[PDB]
Design a binder for this molecule. Structure first.
Ligand SMILES: *[C@@H]1O[C@H](CO)[C@@H](O[C@@H]2O[C@H](CO)[C@@H](O[C@@H]3O[C@H](CO[C@H]4O[C@H](CO)[C@@H](O)[C@H](O)[C@@H]4O)[C@@H](O)[C@H](O[C@H]4O[C@H](CO)[C@@H](O)[C@H](O)[C@@H]4O[C@H]4O[C@H](CO)[C@@H](O)[C@H](O)[C@@H]4O)[C@@H]3O)[C@H](O)[C@H]2NC(C)=O)[C@H](O)[C@H]1NC(C)=O
Ligand SMILES: *[C@@H]1O[C@H](CO)[C@@H](O[C@@H]2O[C@H](CO)[C@@H](O[C@@H]3O[C@H](CO[C@H]4O[C@H](CO)[C@@H](O)[C@H](O)[C@@H]4O)[C@@H](O)[C@H](O[C@H]4O[C@H](CO)[C@@H](O)[C@H](O)[C@@H]4O)[C@@H]3O)[C@H](O)[C@H]2NC(C)=O)[C@H](O)[C@H]1NC(C)=O
Lengths: 139, 52
C-alpha cells in the first residue's frame, strides 16, 4: 500500500504541498504518477516523473501551476500546487506503476554502436495507489 | 663430388626468414577482408536436438 498526506484546506491564492510515501523503500523501481479526481467529472492525469529520473512529463494544462518532485533519500513523492483555484478543490491520488520503455528509431553506427535513440516510453499500468488526499479551497 | 660442408639446421636463417614470410602473407591476405567488429553483441543462446 501507499500513504498520503492528510486532508488539507487552503485559502485560494497561496500554495499547497502533498506528500506520498511508500513503506520504507520497497517501491523504487516502479514509476510515479499523480492523478486528480473532480467528483462527477471523471479523473485527470496530473503527470509523471518516471523512476530512473530521465522524465518529468506534466500535462501542459497543469504545467504552470503544478510541480512533481521525488526525494530519493527519503523515497517521497512531492506534489506542489500554486494557483489553488476553485477547480483544484478535489482529491489528488499518488500512484505507483510500471511503464514500457520501448526502443523506437535508433541510429546505430557503422561499427555497431548506438549513436542515439528516441526510445520513447509507454505507460503500462498503475498497480499501487495512495489512499487519496482531499484538498479543499474555500473563499 | 669430393665436397664436404658443415650444416646446422638450428642456426639456419632460412627457417626464420620463411616464418617471417608466412606471417606477412597471412596478415596481408586478411587486410582486404570484411571487418567483424559489429559481432561483439550480447548473444541470447540456447542449447541445441538430435545430438549424440
Ligand atoms: C534486439 O533489439 C530489440 C529492440 O526492439 C530488443 O527487444 C526489446 O528489448 C527491450 C529491452 O529489454 C525490451 O524492453 C522491455 O520490454 C518489457 C516488455 O516486454 C514485454 O512486452 C513486449 C511487447 O511490448 C514483448 O515483445 C516482450 O516479449 C515482453 O512480453 C518492458 O516491461 C521493460 O520495461 C522494464 O524496463 C524498463 C527499462 O528498460 C523500465 O523502465 C520499466 O519500468 C521496466 O522495468 C523492469 O525492470 C525493473 C528493474 O529494472 C523491474 O523492477 C520492473 O518490475 C520491470 O520488470 C523493457 O522496456 C523490449 O520489450 C524488447 N522488444 C521490443 C519490440 O522493443 C532485443 O532485446 C534485442 N536483442 C538482444 C539485445 O539480444
Ligand atoms: C550517460 O547515460 C546516463 C544514463 O544512461 C545518463 O544519466 C542520466 O542522464 C539524463 C540526461 O539525459 C538525466 O536526466 C536529467 O536529469 C536532470 C537532473 O535534474 C535534477 O534537478 C532537477 C531540478 O532542477 C530535478 O527536478 C530533477 O529531478 C533532478 O533532481 C533533470 O533536470 C533533467 O530534466 C530535464 O529534462 C527532462 C527530459 O529529459 C524534462 O522533462 C525536464 O523538464 C527537464 O527539462 C533530466 O531529467 C538523468 O538525471 C541522468 N541520470 C543519472 C543517474 O545520471 C548520463 O547523463 C549519460 N551521460 C552522457 C555523457 O551521455
Amino acid at each position: 500500500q501507499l500513504v498520503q498526506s492528510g486532508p488539507e484546506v487552503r485559502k485560494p491564492g497561496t500554495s499547497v504541498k502533498v506528500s506520498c510515501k511508500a513503506p520504507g523503500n520497497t517501491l523504487k523501481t516502479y514509476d510515479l504518477h499523480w492523478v486528480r479526481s473532480v467528483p462527477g467529472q471523471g479523473l485527470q492525469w496530473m503527470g509523471w516523473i518516471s523512476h530512473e529520473g530521465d522524465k518529468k512529463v506534466i500535462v501542459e494544462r497543469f504545467k504552470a501551476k503544478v510541480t512533481i518532485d521525488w526525494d530519493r533519500s527519503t523515497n517521497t513523492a512531492y506534489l506542489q500546487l500554486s494557483g489553488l483555484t476553485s477547480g483544484d478543490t478535489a482529491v489528488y491520488y499518488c500512484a505507483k506503476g510500471s511503464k514500457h520503455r520501448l526502443r523506437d528509431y535508433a541510429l546505430y553506427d557503422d561499427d555497431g554502436a548506438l549513436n542515439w535513440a528516441v526510445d520513447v516510453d509507454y505507460l503500462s499500468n498503475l498497480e499501487f495507489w495512495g489512499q487519496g488526499t482531499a484538498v479543499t479551497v474555500s473563499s | 663430388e669430393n665436397v664436404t660442408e658443415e650444416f646446422n639446421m638450428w642456426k639456419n636463417n632460412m627457417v626464420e626468414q620463411m616464418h617471417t614470410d608466412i606471417i606477412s602473407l597471412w596478415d596481408q591476405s586478411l587486410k582486404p577482408c570484411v571487418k567483424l567488429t559489429p559481432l561483439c553483441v550480447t548473444l541470447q543462446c540456447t542449447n541445441v536436438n538430435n545430438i549424440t
